[PDB]
Amino acid sequence: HWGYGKHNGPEHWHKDFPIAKGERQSPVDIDTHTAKYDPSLKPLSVSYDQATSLRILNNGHAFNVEFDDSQDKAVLKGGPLDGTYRLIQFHFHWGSLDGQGSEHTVDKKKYAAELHLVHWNTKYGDFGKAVQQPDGLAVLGIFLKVGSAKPGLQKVVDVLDSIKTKGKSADFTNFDPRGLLPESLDYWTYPGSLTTPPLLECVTWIVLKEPISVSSEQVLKFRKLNFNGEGEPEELMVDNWRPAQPLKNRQIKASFK
Numbered sequence: 001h002w003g004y005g006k007h008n009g010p011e012h013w014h015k016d017f018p019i020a021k022g023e024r025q026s027p028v029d030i031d032t033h034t035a036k037y038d039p040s041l042k043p044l045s046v047s048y049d050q051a052t053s054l055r056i057l058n059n060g061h062a063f064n065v066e067f068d069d070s071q072d073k074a075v076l077k078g079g080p081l082d083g084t085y086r087l088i089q090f091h092f093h094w095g096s097l098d099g100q101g102s103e104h105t106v107d108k109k110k111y112a113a114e115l116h117l118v119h120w121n122t123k124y125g126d127f128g129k130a131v132q133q134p135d136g137l138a139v140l141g142i143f144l145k146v147g148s149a150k151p152g153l154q155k156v157v158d159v160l161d162s163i164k165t166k167g168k169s170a171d172f173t174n175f176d177p178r179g180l181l182p183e184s185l186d187y188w189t190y191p192g193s194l195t196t197p198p199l200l201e202c203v204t205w206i207v208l209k210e211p212i213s214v215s216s217e218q219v220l221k222f223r224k225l226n227f228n229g230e231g232e233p234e235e236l237m238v239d240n241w242r243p244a245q246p247l248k249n250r251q252i253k254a255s256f257k
């Protein structure tokens with residue numbers, strides 16, 4: 001099936017998912033000089049006080065921290081969005097080395113990792129319906145650089161032992177995603193896609209300007225995960241990022257001057 005290798009990685013996905021060569025694919029390089037400030041954009045509203053985390057899963061491609069999305073409990077609104085988007089999961093993309101790992105780039109700079117907080121538009125009733133719509137999802141993307149530790153991340157890092165291999169899950173209740181956010185909510189936004197198969201063109205991307213800092217030790221623990229299942233040959237879960245795609249006929253807008 002699809003993955004990140006030589007024989008099954010991003011450069012192959014188009015055969016099973018021709019939308020890979022579409023008009024609104026993600027990620028992209030953010031050219032900071034050509035992104036235009038849009039005074040009509042709003043402050044982002046990220047309301048995570050009632051978030052209810054449930055479980056953490058190694059899906060063979062990343063790990064997902066899953067939320068209860070059966071009520072408006074952790075919602076994204078404002079910014080470029082019309083209406084209300086409910087948090088379903090977050091995950092990361094990361095590298096084999098600190099010099100790569102992010103999906104978006106900023107003036108071609110690659111960060112060590114990138115956090116995706118995935119939310120679906122409540123007007124479509126559930127996730128699976130939302131991904132069929134051009135305004136179905138809102139993904140908040142946050143860059144990670146290596147430096148100081150992120151205290152709020154440590155709970156995630158320390159459960160990773162228990163979900164080493166593909167298909168393993170663990171209870172992961174009472175985790176507060178507010179501890180993964182930077183100080184500033186300044187952002188760039190553009191219309192794009194999921195960055196993994198099926199590559200659906202359903203996402204309003206909201207990429208924060210300010211990265212969070214994590215320690216080397218934290219990211220090193222990400223890199224101990226496995227793509228493989230239990231008792232299969234070990235293949236470290238690293239470089240689970242799609243490179244930048246053509247911007248085509250899109251504009252990236254900045255929320256800040």
Ligand SMILES: [Co+2]
Binds near residue numbers: 091092195
């Ligand atoms: Co992602």
